[PDB]
Amino acid sequence: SSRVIVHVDLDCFYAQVEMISNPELKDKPLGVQQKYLVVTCNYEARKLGVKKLMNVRDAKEKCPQLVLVNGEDLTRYREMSYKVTELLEEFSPVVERLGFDENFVDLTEMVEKRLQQLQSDELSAVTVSGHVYNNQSINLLDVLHIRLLVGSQIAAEMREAMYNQLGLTGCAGVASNKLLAKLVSGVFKPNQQTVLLPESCQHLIHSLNHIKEIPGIGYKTAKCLEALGINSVRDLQTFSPKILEKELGISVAQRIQKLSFGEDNSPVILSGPPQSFSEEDSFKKCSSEVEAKNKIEELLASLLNRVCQDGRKPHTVRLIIRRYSGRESRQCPIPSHVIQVMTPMVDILMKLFRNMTLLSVCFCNLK
Amino acid sequence: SSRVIVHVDLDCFYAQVEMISNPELKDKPLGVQQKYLVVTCNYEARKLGVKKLMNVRDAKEKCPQLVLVNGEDLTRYREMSYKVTELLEEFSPVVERLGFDENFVDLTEMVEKRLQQLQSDELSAVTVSGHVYNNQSINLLDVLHIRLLVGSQIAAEMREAMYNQLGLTGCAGVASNKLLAKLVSGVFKPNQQTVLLPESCQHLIHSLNHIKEIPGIGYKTAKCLEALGINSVRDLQTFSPKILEKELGISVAQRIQKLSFGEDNSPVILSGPPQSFSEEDSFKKCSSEVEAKNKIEELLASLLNRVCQDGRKPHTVRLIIRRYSGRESRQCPIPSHVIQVMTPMVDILMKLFRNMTLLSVCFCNLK
DNA sequence: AAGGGTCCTAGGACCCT
DNA sequence: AAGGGTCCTAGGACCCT
Ligand SMILES: [Mg+2]
Ligand SMILES: [Mg+2]
Ligand SMILES: [Mg+2]
Ligand SMILES: [Mg+2]
Ligand SMILES: [Mg+2]
Ligand SMILES: [Mg+2]
Numbered sequence: 001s002s003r004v005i006v007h008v009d010l011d012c013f014y015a016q017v018e019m020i021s022n023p024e025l026k027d028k029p030l031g032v033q034q035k036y037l038v039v040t041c042n043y044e045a046r047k048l049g050v051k052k053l054m055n056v057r058d059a060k061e062k063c064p065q066l067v068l069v070n071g072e073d074l075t076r077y078r079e080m081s082y083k084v085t086e087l088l089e090e091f092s093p094v095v096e097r098l099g100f101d102e103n104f105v106d107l108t109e110m111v112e113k114r115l116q117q118l119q120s121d122e123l124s125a126v127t128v129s130g131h132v133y134n135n136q137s138i139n140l141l142d143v144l145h146i147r148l149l150v151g152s153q154i155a156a157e158m159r160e161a162m163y164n165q166l167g168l169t170g171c172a173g174v175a176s177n178k179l180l181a182k183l184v185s186g187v188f189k190p191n192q193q194t195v196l197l198p199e200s201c202q203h204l205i206h207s208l209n210h211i212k213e214i215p216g217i218g219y220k221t222a223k224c225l226e227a228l229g230i231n232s233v234r235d236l237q238t239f240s241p242k243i244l245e246k247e248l249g250i251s252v253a254q255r256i257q258k259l260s261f262g263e264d265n266s267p268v269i270l271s272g273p274p275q276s277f278s279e280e281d282s283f284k285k286c287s288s289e290v291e292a293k294n295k296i297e298e299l300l301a302s303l304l305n306r307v308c309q310d311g312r313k314p315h316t317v318r319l320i321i322r323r324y325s326g327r328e329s330r331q332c333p334i335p336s337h338v339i340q341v342m343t344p345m346v347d348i349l350m351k352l353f354r355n356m357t358l359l360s361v362c363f364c365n366l367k
Numbered sequence: 368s369s370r371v372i373v374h375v376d377l378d379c380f381y382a383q384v385e386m387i388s389n390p391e392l393k394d395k396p397l398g399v400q401q402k403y404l405v406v407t408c409n410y411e412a413r414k415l416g417v418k419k420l421m422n423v424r425d426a427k428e429k430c431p432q433l434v435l436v437n438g439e440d441l442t443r444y445r446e447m448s449y450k451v452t453e454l455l456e457e458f459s460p461v462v463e464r465l466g467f468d469e470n471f472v473d474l475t476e477m478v479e480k481r482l483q484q485l486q487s488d489e490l491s492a493v494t495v496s497g498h499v500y501n502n503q504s505i506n507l508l509d510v511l512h513i514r515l516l517v518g519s520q521i522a523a524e525m526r527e528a529m530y531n532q533l534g535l536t537g538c539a540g541v542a543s544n545k546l547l548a549k550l551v552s553g554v555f556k557p558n559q560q561t562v563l564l565p566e567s568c569q570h571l572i573h574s575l576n577h578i579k580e581i582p583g584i585g586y587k588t589a590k591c592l593e594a595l596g597i598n599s600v601r602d603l604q605t606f607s608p609k610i611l612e613k614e615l616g617i618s619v620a621q622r623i624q625k626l627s628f629g630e631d632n633s634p635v636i637l638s639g640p641p642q643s644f645s646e647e648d649s650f651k652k653c654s655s656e657v658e659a660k661n662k663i664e665e666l667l668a669s670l671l672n673r674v675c676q677d678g679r680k681p682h683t684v685r686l687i688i689r690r691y692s693g694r695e696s697r698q699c700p701i702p703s704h705v706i707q708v709m710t711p712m713v714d715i716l717m718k719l720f721r722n723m724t725l726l727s728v729c730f731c732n733l734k
Numbered sequence: 735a736a737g738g739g740t741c742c743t744a745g746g747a748c749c750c751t
Numbered sequence: 752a753a754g755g756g757t758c759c760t761a762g763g764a765c766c767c768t
Contacts, residue, residue: 009750013750013751014751032751033753034751034753034754035752035753035754036752037753037754039751039753039754040751053751053753071751071753072753072754073754074751074754074755077751077755078755097750097757098749098756098757099749099750099751099755099756099757100750100756101750101751102749102750215748216748216749217748218747218748219747219748220748221748245718246721249699250699250715251699251700252747254702265703274756275756275757275758276755276756276757278754278756279755280754281752281754282752282753282754283752284752285752316742322752327745328744328745329745330743331742331743331744332618333742335621336632348617351612351617358752358753360755376767380767380768381768382768400736401737401768402735402736402737403735404735404737406736406737407768419768420736438736438737438768439737440737441738441768445738464739464740465740465766465767466738466739466740467738467767468767468768469766469767582765583766585765585766586764586765587763587764587765588764588765618742638740641739642739642741643740645737645739646737646738647737648735648737649735649736649737653735683759689735694762695762696760696761696762697760697761698759698760698761699760700759724735725736727737727738
């Protein structure tokens, strides 16, 4: 039953990429811009007040010397994201992606192979790589302690390999399930790693200050929980299961309540190739007429290219819109003759358009 | 591109099963009863006026000597259904199920292997098994004619095997795609087979009298088409694509219009093991109070048994209801500890019940 | 008061930058 | 005026007996 999981989280991902291809930006405070949004920034800029997901106005206020690069085309970030996952797949092939910069790996089978190859002499010599959460004391006779420490050594090899092979830095967290691995990897956020021994599981979850910090609990779920007087991890631990079921559902209630105890039995899933390809564009209630084709035609040309590179073929298309005030969408299957180019697709999408501040296209259901 | 497909359709399936396990019912007119509904009947009863899906009142009127057996528990029909599919899977493993009594098989690879094993001498000796649709003339030099005729010989071997091994009779239709195979298999409905040569494709589709007879066109679609003045296959062939798209959708319009020409490029899919297990019960606004557990508990006990036999494990449950006047449903995932029994499930379902003339349970999303 | 099946759709929730 | 991802839900359509 006992598992050793690792969670790898790159530091200021987009910014770290821009700082790589243009070393001239290192040491200088950097923000990565998407329209009016500074979506992330390096640490030279966080010190100066800039914060993730900050207005381009407020950010230049706290740092007028802030150098900004446009990060709207994710192509380069996506390509590097998959270079990271692919390298980790060398260690163990079961690698789950979370967004572009986070990866889960189940190290269990790999920890146990390393253990058989050791002797009674070197086992007492097993050491930790990186921080132990809560400065908790190690017990070389606790077999769970030994396995987690081996997990931290693997985690350090990955992080070094990532830097040696892709010049990227990041954090790692080693724990017994995915929830705790992710929560502990950020205890030392700047290019460091942390291992969570079981006896500190409760210190970790109770170190949080709002239930939203639990991966699995978002805006709607949080707000519903505070409309019930649930503001802390412990409030949710002790809240009535029944009342929780008959207010949020039997699936939401019974899993988030297990997350509040640090429990999470979900396996690390192999993300493999993507299940979808999409592109978005946003605009200040600009598209006011059907000549919004050009904006659509742009999105296809990049998707069609990305698909051709992927080699697989999609069988469903989707169009999304956002309307000046909540999103609406229409999809349909892809004609067969088309699957084996640009002109016909457009006319499908506009038929979808006419059935109905943002336009987006997606290719899903891939073979 | 050229395919040889076969469609196998058993004669009065439920009735033929009841006549097997009780030979005493053969020769006598038989209906299979589900509540007030005579869902099917043998041919000794169709002659006497009884019709598929007929009131138990009107049927006994046209035939008071009608012997009826209850067919509400489908267990036996389902078990025989899969004995049929499994036997056909011996011929070629790619077998698509349609309901309990119909099966599609792609005979293409099997037709071509048989052809290489022949000599120029026996090829002119190739003969048809069963009817040729529209008494059309065979051309032993048309390679498509030869392949379809080989398809009819395989179809005859299946039907014989089905009778020799399971004592079941049925019809087969051999054509170049799934739509036409299904349409031609019923031209001689009582334990016979028919092959459709390409030059008669249009005689077959135009032999239909309402667009509803096209597999793919149902109640809602038919009615929408008649609200537009489309009553015949040809009306739909000639109807405006645009008007069809902007009234039914780009997926519905552009495929049903291809079905009206006898075109259908969908492949024969391997149905394999089921994707769901469900049980239903109906009742004259009977369940009026929460003690409807007993009716639910019945459905679980049979599903739980069927699942245990299957060996796979489900990960989602669903509850369906119908309310005296349109169905409503609630589902959720299956707790993990449960997956590896009866008491806990009930309390999930009732929570689903309280969130909300028929009750039903389903196990889906199987591993 | 049938008793089952299949697959799709539009929208929702969650996770990142 | 971010720009992407994942998976689930309730209901719909279609096909049989
Ligand atoms: Mg991250
Ligand atoms: Mg990060
Ligand atoms: Mg959260
Ligand atoms: Mg049939
Ligand atoms: Mg039949
Ligand atoms: Mg039809």
